[PDB]
Amino acid sequence: VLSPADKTNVKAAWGKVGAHAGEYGAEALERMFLSFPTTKTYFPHFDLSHGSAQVKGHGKKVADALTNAVAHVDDMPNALSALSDLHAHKLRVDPVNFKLLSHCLLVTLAAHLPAEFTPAVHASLDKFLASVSTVLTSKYR
């Protein structure tokens, strides 16, 4: 469960990300594809190399979903309901991959937010991304 401090930390950190949310989403995806090549199996229809228009566009979608999750941090199962439907019935990504993307999002945030990415905020963001991941895999079976 996300603590009061967790939610304060997530809102502060994502707030600082601000207009960069989409850029950072795309960067996290690129980091994932390069660091964890097995994740590329879910994107055979994508150009995955640097400067990909498809990756940039998908990064924006992922980031916007996270922004919505932050806005509804006390009701994520319902706020993300349509998206969790899509993941369960269509995308059907194995749950391990959510940890890989989450890690790459953390790396991206660490690389861009020197002052903000404290150990406590790091901890809170990891919990947050784990909670989002849990919601998105909650309807798999």
């Binding site: 990504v93 194995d94 079976r141």
Partner: protein
């Protein structure tokens, strides 16, 4: 993975009693029932709407047999699983686009199917040997991913 000479014997001995048709069909079938998101790879197999439909599906059964046949061939290469599955590894990566995590799931289900069939004969030490094998096969099938 590194099996002991005693474990290699136990693996080979148990496998000599395995009905590959039944176990193969059961393993692939249960993969699709227990972890239904794995059905994403088998839309061309037709009706996968119910557990009975999945287990009774001719293409599921045929594929399961084929998969377990390749698995069986690997049991004759226990000291070089990477080498013998290198071709299939590349295939699953580049042509089939199968997340290797699925190899682990199938290994899990296969061990359950072996336990179901053999009962008390599937002793904890025999299970341990087979866990080494399914881990080895999954790792070998994932090894050439890029």
């Amino acid at each position: 993975v590194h099996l002991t000479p005693e474990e290699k014997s136990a693996v080979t001995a148990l496998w000599g009693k395995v009905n590959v048709d039944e176990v193969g069909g059961e393993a692939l079938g249960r993969l699709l029932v227990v972890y239904p998101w794995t059905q994403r790879f088998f839309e061309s197999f037709g009706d996968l709407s119910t557990p009975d439909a999945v287990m009774g599906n001719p293409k599921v059964k045929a594929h399961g047999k084929k998969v377990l046949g390749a698995f069986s061939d690997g049991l004759a290469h226990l000291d070089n699983l990477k080498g013998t599955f290198a071709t299939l590894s590349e295939l699953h990566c580049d042509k089939l686009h199968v997340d290797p995590e699925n190899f682990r799931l199938l290994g899990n289900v296969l061990v359950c199917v072996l336990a179901h069939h053999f009962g008390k004969e599937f002793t904890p030490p025999v299970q341990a040997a087979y866990q080494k094998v399914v881990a080895g096969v999954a790792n070998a099938l994932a090894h050439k991913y890029h």
